From a paper:
SulE, an esterase, which detoxifies a variety of sulfonylurea herbicides through de-esterification, provides an attractive approach to remove environmental sulfonylurea herbicides and develop herbicide-tolerant crops.
To understand the molecular basis for the altered activity by Pro44 mutation, the crystal structures of apo-P44R, the double mutant P44R/S209A in complex with CA, and the triple mutant P44R/S209A/H333A in complex with MM, CE, and TM were determined in the range of 1.32–1.78 Å. In the structure of P44R/S209A in complex with CA, each subunit bound a CA molecule in the substrate binding pocket; unexpectedly, an extra CE molecule bound to the interface of the dimer and also interacted with the symmetric molecule B. This CE molecule does not cause any change in protein conformation, suggesting that it may only play a role in crystal packing. Structural comparison showed that CA and CE are well superimposed, indicating that binding the product also induces the conformational change in the structures containing the P44R mutation. However, it was found that the SulE S209A and P44R/S209A mutants still retained weak activity in this study. The distance between His333 and the substrate is too long to have a direct reaction; therefore, the reason why SulE S209A and P44R/S209A mutants still retain de-esterification activity may be that a water molecule got into the active site and was directly deprotonated by His333 when Ser209 is mutated to alanine, and then as a nucleophile to attack the ester bond of the substrate.
Residue numbers in the entry:
A (entry chain B), B (entry chain A): 12 to 360
């Protein structure tokens, strides 16, 4: 089960643009100096890895990490078991994994000067934000509070250090430029399936409205909902009566209707409450966010779509976290993804 | 020949520490906020990838990228040919590739606040530095000035954008903490060989003085020379009679002596001038830096060592850049690395 046979593997950079400092470069002057003089910088490019099996069947899969993550989460679980990259090469799909602009091997746009600043232009903000171990613990629903685990947890307990070390900050790159890089990738590889997670959920939906080569989407616990412009349904605030979920993204209806042309599945793990929970902000946040997504999928289906919501507990899988593809039962989670691909013929040539 | 059979592959995080923000975490309060309140942050951890062949022979190889780079440079060349990772898995070595702390999938230590600042504490500097395309062009000796190639160049022309997109800034993480992470990796792996490049040259030498598991070093064009404390020889300034090379790193003789106990090879490419070249700063810089390394290797041999300098043109290979392992003749470069491993018994069990 750890063995993998690759016809080919590799990695490359795609997307991005260039920005430039003032003046001219002189090769006789000291080159190692604090200066943007005569400088050309490549910024906002994306890193892409691929592994291809011998005799691939069906469409390539593009795995797109969630917020603050990298392609590592598709490579291995925190306790060292095979990730979805290995599992789906074994399932005879070519597999692409990316580090989006601003994350991991993607570009972080900084120069000579305060972070993110190229002379007078602010490419990204100098002030950053970042989550904590404690924030990530409850965001990911390991348990209701740091140090605590829900009863039938599929988290790989004992490997907390490995898990939280994989997370980090994102600079303030425009979401337009992240979408642009993946649109370019989808043009490059041809017909494919996007497999997204959390923060890349809404970005993958946006990519699909720009790229007909996206033939299906599976999104693990997407973080932001998407609706036709001006048609966002009423969404309640959280139980604290003061907080709200992420403002839904709105796109013009002519683009939204492209989401009705491909199969789309949103997958949710366990321990999302049915009723308000004022004591546990992130549990309540997930309740209302999942509700918003159910309305988003309904709007897609009313336009002729093929969108569905899969709650892993309804499929017989209990205890999954916000990362079902690295949980202890990730092989069973992968089996459900294979089922989706097979149902729609995305595993056949 | 692109096919690769892996007994196993994966990745993991290792090394690093934690820093903590003020106060306590309350799961009832909004978790997504501009605050380090109650926050634990994992910082300065390293990303590690591994690919193991069936029936490995000899010691595992740890490939360590140069300055501003990532493990991508061992995966593929800019024009998409197999990198040393593939070539040496095919050569029946287990291959580790790393993204060191502060680069790629390694941690970049920043929080909520100005880049690198945790409340009143500066973990890394807010002001960054970075090379340009122009500076990298002449540092890497593609040619004497940006956009110009040496006639004999082994660079994969036409893939310049791909090449420069792989480079980025590094935050001011202490070199001690980078060495510490690799020492911990070497402890985990067991006996191994370090293959370093440019900025990681001096760091790999330091790791070997702390880790008897390092059984050999091959360094491609190391950037900083190393000497016993108080025994730095006379090194001239550059031809401009103003600039100097990087100040040599000095270590205790009792640690320096450990470098005499393992085989060490420094590898240099082509187009490094023999005589002073005041018109081309980085060509002259490489002349004096290579000279300093010659004296460093001499110092190791006078302690009973086996340290050698391989100039690729003397082996019949002409035109190599600062990245010989991604140049057009990188298969021939790899053959010379296999020759070194075989002479010293590092390719047998
Ligand atoms: C006219 C050719 O198209 C391009 O210019 C182009 C476009 C987008 C990304 C990369 C390239 S590229 O060629 O500069 N490089 C690649 O195509 N890279 C690449 N490298 C690997 Cl190792 C694999 C791959 O696709 C599987 N693609
Ligand atoms: C957890 O605690 C904190 C603290 C602070 Cl300051 N910022 C964040 N931001 C995110 O988690 N941003 S997200 O983009 O990864 C994301 C958000 C909601 C739900 C999911 C995700 C996610 O992609 O995993 N989380
Ligand atoms: C090229 O032009 C500029 C401009 C500025 Cl501001 N800073 C740098 N820094 C480096 O290249 N730093 S290095 O660490 O990668 C390195 C240095 C010398 C020789 C080799 C390397 C190297 O690792 O490849 N280069
Ligand atoms: Ca989302």
């Amino acid at each position: 089960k750890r063995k993998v046979v690759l016809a080919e593997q590799g990695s490359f950079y795609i997307g991005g643009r260039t920005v430039t400092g003032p003046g001219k470069f002189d090769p006789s002057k000291p080159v190692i100096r604090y200066s943007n003089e005569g400088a050309t910088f490549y910024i906002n490019q994306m890193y892409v890895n691929f592994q291809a099996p011998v005799r691939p069947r069906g469409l390539p899969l593009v795995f797109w990490h969630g917020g603050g993550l990298t392609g590592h989460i598709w490579e291995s679980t925190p306790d060292g078991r095979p990730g979805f990259q290995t599992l789906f090469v074994q399932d005879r799909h070519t597999v692409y994994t990316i580090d989006q602009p601003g994350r991991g091997r993607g570009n972080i746009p900084t120069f000579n000067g305060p972070f993110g600043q190229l002379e007078e232009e602010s490419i990204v903000n100098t002030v950053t934000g970042n989550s904590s171990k404690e924030g990530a613990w409850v965001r990911d629903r390991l348990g209701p509070a740091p140090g605590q685990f829900f009863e039938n947890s599929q988290f790989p307990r004992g490997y907390e250090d490995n898990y939280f070390k994989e997370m980090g900050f994102s600079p303030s790159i425009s979401s337009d430029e992240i979408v642009d890089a993946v649109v370019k990738l989808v043009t490059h590889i041809g017909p494919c399936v996007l497999v997204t997670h959390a923060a890349s959920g809404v970005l993958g939906m946006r990519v699909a409205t720009h790229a007909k080569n996206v033939r299906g989407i599976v999104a693990y616990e997407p973080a932001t909902s998407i609706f036709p412009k001006g048609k966002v349904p009423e969404i309640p605030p959280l139980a604290d009566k003061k907080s709200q979920i992420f403002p839904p993204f709105e796109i013009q209806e002519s683009y939204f209707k492209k989401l009705a042309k491909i199969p789309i599945q949103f997958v949710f793990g366990d321990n999302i409450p049915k009723n308000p929970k004022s004591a546990y902000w992130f549990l309540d946040w997930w309740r209302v966010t999942r509700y918003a997504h159910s309305l988003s999928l309904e709007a897609i289906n009313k336009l002729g779509g093929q969108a569905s919501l899969l709650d892993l507990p309804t499929a017989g899988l209990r205890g999954n976290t916000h990362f079902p593809f690295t949980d202890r039962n990730n092989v069973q989670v992968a089996s459900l993804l294979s089922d989706f691909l097979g149902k729609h013929g995305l595993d056949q040539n």
